[PDB]
Amino acid sequence: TIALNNVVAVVTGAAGGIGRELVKAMKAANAIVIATDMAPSADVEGADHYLQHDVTSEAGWKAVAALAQEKYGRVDALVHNAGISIVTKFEDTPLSDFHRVNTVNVDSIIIGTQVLLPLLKEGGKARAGGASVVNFSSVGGLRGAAFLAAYCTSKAAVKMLSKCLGAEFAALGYNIRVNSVHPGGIDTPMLGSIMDKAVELGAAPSREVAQAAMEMRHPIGRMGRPAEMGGGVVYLCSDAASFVTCTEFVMDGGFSQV
Amino acid sequence: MTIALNNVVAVVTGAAGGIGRELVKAMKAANAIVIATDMAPSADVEGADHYLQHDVTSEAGWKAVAALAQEKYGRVDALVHNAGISIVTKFEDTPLSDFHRVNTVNVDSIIIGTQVLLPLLKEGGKARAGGASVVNFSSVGGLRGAAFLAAYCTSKAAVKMLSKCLGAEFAALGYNIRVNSVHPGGIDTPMLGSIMDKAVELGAAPSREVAQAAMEMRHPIGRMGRPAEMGGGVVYLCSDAASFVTCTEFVMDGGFSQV
Amino acid sequence: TIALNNVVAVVTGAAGGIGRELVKAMKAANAIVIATDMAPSADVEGADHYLQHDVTSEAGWKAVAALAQEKYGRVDALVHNAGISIVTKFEDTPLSDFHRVNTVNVDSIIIGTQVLLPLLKEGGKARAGGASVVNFSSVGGLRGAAFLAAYCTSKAAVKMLSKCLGAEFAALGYNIRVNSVHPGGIDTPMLGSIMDKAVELGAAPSREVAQAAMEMRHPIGRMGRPAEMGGGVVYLCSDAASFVTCTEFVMDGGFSQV
Amino acid sequence: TIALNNVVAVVTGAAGGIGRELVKAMKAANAIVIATDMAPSADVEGADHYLQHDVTSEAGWKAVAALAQEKYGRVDALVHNAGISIVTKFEDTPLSDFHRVNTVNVDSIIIGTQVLLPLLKEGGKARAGGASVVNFSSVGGLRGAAFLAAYCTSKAAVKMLSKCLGAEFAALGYNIRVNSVHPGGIDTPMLGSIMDKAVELGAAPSREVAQAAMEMRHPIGRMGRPAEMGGGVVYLCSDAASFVTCTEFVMDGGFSQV
Ligand SMILES: NC(=O)c1ccc[n+]([C@@H]2O[C@H](COP(=O)([O-])OP(=O)(O)OC[C@H]3O[C@@H](n4cnc5c(N)ncnc54)[C@H](O)[C@@H]3O)[C@@H](O)[C@H]2O)c1
Ligand SMILES: NC(=O)c1ccc[n+]([C@@H]2O[C@H](COP(=O)([O-])OP(=O)(O)OC[C@H]3O[C@@H](n4cnc5c(N)ncnc54)[C@H](O)[C@@H]3O)[C@@H](O)[C@H]2O)c1
Ligand SMILES: NC(=O)c1ccc[n+]([C@@H]2O[C@H](COP(=O)([O-])OP(=O)(O)OC[C@H]3O[C@@H](n4cnc5c(N)ncnc54)[C@H](O)[C@@H]3O)[C@@H](O)[C@H]2O)c1
Ligand SMILES: NC(=O)c1ccc[n+]([C@@H]2O[C@H](COP(=O)([O-])OP(=O)(O)OC[C@H]3O[C@@H](n4cnc5c(N)ncnc54)[C@H](O)[C@@H]3O)[C@@H](O)[C@H]2O)c1
Incomplete structure (x- = not known):
């Protein structure tokens, strides 16, 4: 079947809404999971290890590399799930707000992947299918939206970085697959904040009209x-996805396709 | 839970072909009940619970598939439209009837088959919260054009767009049927073999080795699939794990379309 | 800058909403225009010739080729603008309705381009920039929609045929550019009928609610x-577009990009 | 007709290979052109004004706004053409190289558009078709490539920022169109440097094999x-493009579509 037997997996933002479900799903497929987030401690069901980890910190990433190096000697799967959103009027958004979003959503992938690259190369030797790097983009990386300039721009950067790394790692013979994941509206605190800030900005009349409008834009007719x-990330991390690199893996209830 | 097809009744067309045989094996391995169909009057398809002779261009052929599924199971949970053909031709020497022949196998198959199995797919939609799953075989050729592949590419773009429309329509009508398109890159089957040989005979390529190396180098991963x-991708789309995936381009192309 | 001096242009569906404006725009850029449509006669402002022409008829296309051959000896620009739409429930749509839409929207381009290919090759020798074939696809060729299965499928076929012919004509050295045009909701009888059938199908509560919904899906906030x-088709037909082939030329008020 | 009569246009990187042709083309369509680049002085054919302008400098942009405000009272067209490229091995690329490319290619558009927004709103009142913002992305913003991680990521950011601003400015009623332009391989010093650096990196055997490979990846069979x-940018800046916003305008010889 589709499984993660003998897969050492790093999942960032692992205490968040999607992150907790990724850890559960990956443990259920038999992965060894190093879960990381900003809290000094967390109870992440399915994590074999929890580390305090700011994804903007090279030192934080070196601590992840040290634990993986010492305990396992490789990383087979790297899930860059940590990210933030802001909802703002472009003309009232200082350059520093774009930079803050870029640092969390994009620099995290650049720093993290550079620091774990020796360990990912070892995973490329451990499985014929390759090591697997899974970058959390968004439907916002595919389709623009009013008031989401900073967020959408960062998620398009994540998408394109994924394509470039997939092509480069294959050309250099590292056997490391890199793919971008594009969630639609997923029922988490992040989507909650975006909807509330949309109301305060006066993009939506009320939080109920906003919610109904966003749900109706998804052909499937609801939030995810x-x-x-979970299953999509397990698939991309598994040997079943051995022919999948540089790809836009969409889980959006049809949002981007209508 | 995990990614599995427990109590999934699956129809797979072109099941005796290179990809089709691996789809049946993968889906059986995930515990699906598989009705395999192809043009041969009989075939030994590893993992098939049933084999039916089935021309995907024939409404009567599809009604025989519906009758067996109706009688034995009362539903269809997964429908994989994998049957397809390719031609390689000079546009100016391609009669309208060659476009129509490719369209009939690659597109009309999905229209006729999905219409005939729709009552059974609606029952699939009631049997699983995630929905019935219709998986349409498009191509990277449905995403990116190519010289001398006008008839094939046009049909595979039609498959892709039909997938989006049916996903949106079945959701709007409340049927709980997911529809997605699959886009393979160059996969090592008799079909890829014939396309390369016919490219040589047409005088597109010097040799079968230069053709193969060129096609392999277009894939960032550096080889054919x-x-x-x-198999895993089709199992995922057919499973409840893909409950939020409809209207989607599911690409398995070694990076071909993205560089 | 952007002009069609010494350009012999064939425009199909030339009596329709967009077609009439294409002929005016192309005449204003100094093209010689052969206008064609289903009516036995028409007063098409800017047309140098009108021909009765069923785009599904090889004999109809041969009559267009004969007039162009006899009077000018070339075709520099071929605009495949003829098309139909239907709005239907998939499960109630006979295969013959898909085939009827395919015959007008796709077979027209196959038959017409094959019949005019000798004349387009002469266009290819007359201008460094090349002969120009402009295929009318749709945003419906880029994004799906409930109840538009037959229409959307045909317009995606038009889009992909455009890419294949652009690549093939370049590989064979014919100097013929081929591009697809993707209009959003344009205020014509065709959009009117689609909206009116959407109501009778019970897709929309009223035509006013349908119209407002469709207008709001366009970021620009209105129908085209x-x-x-006109300007976009003039650009694609001109030497200014000498580096444009196989392209999706979108005129959709931002519809496809949000 | 496609013209820029009474259009006040700002063009950045105006002394470059493409920039000089944009200024000539826009003057030929009767635009008033404020040309800007890094040099303290330059002879830019077709420019009514030249300003020294670092597109990373808020103060530089305020000087452009002051001249346009004083002399014309509006900006009708803003062409963000200034940009840089690097070719690097991801694992040897410091975070500061990504940031440098982002600052020139993306922050330029954020700072410039914020500073000129009052003047663009006046452009929006001067023409029913709207003010026009044209952002130079790349085929690199659509398709990834090995060794172009920093460049491709920045050009995908430019593409998505274009979609977001098009949607936002329309939602706020400012009547400002925003589009991204995606050139293929264009014969300029920038393409020259990329090809040479590809050879030094050992991505290509020789500069002749690199050149032939890049030319053959374009269906049209050559560099642009x-x-x-020029014509494409004139079209997007003109009232002929009144229904074009949020759009990917591709001039790539078919590169992205095969
Ligand atoms: N929820 C949606 O609708 C949606 C849609 C598109 C994509 N996404 C993406 O999915 C991913 C998961 O989002 P979510 O919905 O679970 O949101 P969430 O906010 O619940 O989880 C994000 C997690 O990232 C962590 N994080 C933030 N900054 C960090 C930093 N500097 N260092 C370390 N950790 C940091 C947060 O602590 C949080 O636990 C994100 O990448 C998000 O952008 C979400
Ligand atoms: N191999 C590749 O490189 C490649 C690339 C992209 C897409 N695909 C698609 O994958 C699918 C499977 O292809 P494959 O490579 O295994 O090809 P294949 O030729 O090995 O198998 C296709 C099967 O369809 C069957 N078939 C043909 N016409 C039929 C009809 N009228 N009724 C019933 N069955 C019919 C054939 O007999 C065959 O068993 C096709 O849709 C193909 O277009 C393959
Ligand atoms: N209006 C829109 O919203 C919209 C949307 C996207 C795409 N388009 C496309 O733009 C093009 C122009 O359409 P329009 O909106 O002006 O519609 P229209 O119906 O006003 O014009 C289309 C013309 O095509 C002609 N035609 C139909 N069948 C023909 C045949 N067999 N032979 C010859 N001529 C035939 C009709 O006589 C008519 O004059 C079409 O291809 C259409 O699908 C329009
Ligand atoms: N040439 C190609 O093949 C190609 C490919 C795709 C995209 N592009 C894009 O087209 C645009 C123009 O490219 P080109 O080939 O003319 O490049 P070029 O190097 O010839 O011109 C770019 C100009 O930008 C200017 N510039 C650089 N940094 C600046 C700064 N901080 N402030 C102000 N001006 C600055 C340079 O001085 C130069 O004159 C760029 O945005 C480039 O990314 C070009």
């Missing part, structure tokens, strides 16, 4: 649940 |  | 006017 | 000339 992200 | 590398 | 298609 | 970018 965080658990509905 | 193996048929077995299609 | 037929005249807003 | 800078002049082949």
Whole structure:
């Protein structure tokens, strides 16, 4: 079947809405999971290890590399799930707000992948299918939206970085697959904040009209649940996805395709 | 839970072909009940619970598939439209009837088959919260054009767009049927073999080795796919794990379309 | 800058909403225009010739080729603008309805381009920039929609045929550019009928709710006017577009990109 | 007709290969052109004004706004053409190289558009078709490539920022169109440097094999000339493009579509 036997997996933002479900799903497929987030401690069901980890910190990433190096000697799967959103009027958004979003959503992938690259190369030797790097983009990386300039721009950067790394790692013979994941509206605190800030900005009349409008834009007719992200990430991390690199893996209830 | 097809009644067309045989094996391995169909009057398809002779261009052929599924199971949970053909031709020497022949196998198959199995797919939609799953075999050729592949590419773009429309329509009508398109890159099957040889005979390529190396180098991963590398993706789309996936382009192309 | 001096242009569906504006725009850029449509006669402003022409008829296309051959000896620009739409429930749509839409929207381009290919090759020798074939696809060729299965499928076929012919004509050295045009909601009888059938199908509560919904899906916030298609087609037909082939040329008020 | 009569246009990187052709083409369509680049002085054919302008400098942009405000009272067209490229091995690329490319290619558009927004709103009142913002992305913003991680990521950011601003400015009623332009391989010093650095990196055996490979990846079979970018930018800046916003305008010889 589709499984993660003998897969050492790093999952960032692992205490968040999607992150907790990714850890559960990956443990259920038999992965060894190093879960990381900003809290000094967390109870992440399915994590074999929890590390305090700011994805903007090279030192934080070196601590992840040290634990993986010491305990396992490789990383087979790297899930860059940590990210933030802001909802703002472009003309009232200082350059520093774009930079803050870029640092969390994009620099995290650049720093993390550079620091774990020796360990990912070892995973490329451990499985014929390759090591697997899974970057959380968004439907916002595919389709623009009013008031989401900073967020959408960062998620398009994540998408394109995924294509470039997939092509480069294959050309250099590292046997490391890199793919971008594009969730639609998923029922988490992040989507909650975006909807509330849309109301305060006066993009939506009320939080109920906003919710109904966003749900109706999805052909499937509802928000996604965080658990509905799990199987896709397990697939991309598995040897079943050995021919999948540089790809836009969409889990959006049809949002981007209508 | 995990990614599995427990109590999934699956119809797979072109099931005796290079990819089709691996789809049946993969889906059986995930515990699906598989009705395999192809043009031969009989075939030994590893993992098939039933084999039916089935021309996907024939409404009567599809009604025989519906009758067996109706009688034995009362539903269809997964429908994999994998039957397809390719031609390689000079546009100016391609009669309208060659476009129509490719359209009939690659597109009309999905229209006729989905219409005939729709009552059974609606029952699939009631049997699983995630929905019935219709998986349409498009191509990277449905995403990116190519010289001398006008008839094939046009049909595979039609398959892709039909998938989006049916996903949106079945959701709007409340049927709980997911529809997605699959886009393989160059997969090592008799079909890829014939396309390369016919490219040589047409005088597109010097030799079969230069053709193969050129096609391999277009894939960032640096090689053609193996048929077995299609199996997991189709199992995922057919499973409840893909409950939030409809209208989607599911690409298995070694990076071909993205550089 | 952007002109069609010494350009012999064939425009199909030339009596329709967009077609009439294409002929006006192309005449205004100094093209010689052969206008064609289903009516036995028409007064098409800017046309140097009108021909009765069923785009599904090889004999109809041969009559267009004969007039162009006899009077000018070439075709520099071929605009495949003829098309139909239907709005239907998939499960109630006979295969013959898909085939009827395919015959007008796709077979027209196959038959017409094959019949005019000798004349387009002469266009290819007359201008460094090349002969130009402009195929009318749709945003419906880029994004799906409930109840538009037959229409959307045909317009995606038009889009992909455009890419294949652009690549093939370049590989064979014919100097013929081929591009697809993707209009959004344009205010013509065709959009009117689609909206009116959407109501009778019970897809929309009223035509006013349908119209407002469709207008709001366009970021620009309104339907296009037929005249807003003219400049884009003039550009693609001109030497200014000498580096444009196989391209999706979108005129959709941002519809496809959100 | 496609013209820029009474259009006040700002063009950045105006002394470059493409920039000089954009200024010539826009003057030929009767635009008033404020040309800007890094040099303290330059002889830019077709420019009514030249300003020294670092597109990373808020103060530099305020000087452009002051001249336009004083002399014309509006900006009708803003062409963000300034940009840089690097070719690097991801694992040897410091975070500061990504940031440098982002600052020139993306922050330029954020700072410039914020500073000129009052003047663009006046452009929006001067023409029913709207003010026009044209952002130079790349085929690199659509398709990834090995060794172009920093460049491709920045050009995908430019593409998505274009979609977001098009949607946002329309939602706020400012009547400002925003589009991204995606050139293929254009014969300029920038393409020259990329090809040479590809050889030094050992991505290509020789500069002749690199050149032939890049030319053959374009269906049209050659590099573009800078002049082949001019018509497209004139079209997007004109009232002929009144229904074009949020759009990917591709001038790539078919590169992205095969
Ligand atoms: N929920 C949606 O609708 C949606 C849609 C598109 C994509 N996404 C993406 O999915 C991913 C998961 O989002 P979510 O919905 O679970 O949101 P969430 O906010 O619940 O989870 C994000 C997690 O990232 C962590 N994080 C933030 N900054 C960090 C930093 N500097 N260092 C370390 N950890 C940091 C947060 O602590 C949080 O636990 C994100 O990449 C998000 O952008 C979400
Ligand atoms: N191999 C590749 O490189 C490649 C690339 C992209 C897409 N695909 C698609 O994958 C699918 C499977 O292809 P494959 O490579 O295994 O090809 P294949 O030729 O090995 O198998 C296709 C099967 O369809 C059957 N078939 C043909 N016409 C039929 C009809 N009228 N009724 C019933 N069955 C019919 C054939 O007999 C065959 O068993 C096709 O849709 C193909 O277009 C393959
Ligand atoms: N209006 C829109 O919203 C919209 C949307 C996207 C695409 N388009 C496309 O733009 C093009 C122009 O359409 P329009 O909106 O002006 O519609 P229209 O119906 O006003 O014009 C289309 C013309 O095609 C002609 N035609 C139909 N069948 C023909 C045949 N067999 N032979 C010859 N001529 C035939 C009709 O006589 C008519 O004059 C079409 O291809 C259409 O699908 C329009
Ligand atoms: N030439 C190609 O093949 C190609 C490919 C795709 C995209 N592009 C894009 O086209 C645009 C123009 O490219 P080109 O080939 O003319 O490049 P070029 O190097 O010839 O011109 C770019 C100009 O930008 C200017 N510039 C650089 N940094 C600046 C700064 N901080 N402030 C102000 N001006 C600055 C340079 O001085 C130069 O004159 C760029 O945005 C480039 O990314 C070009």
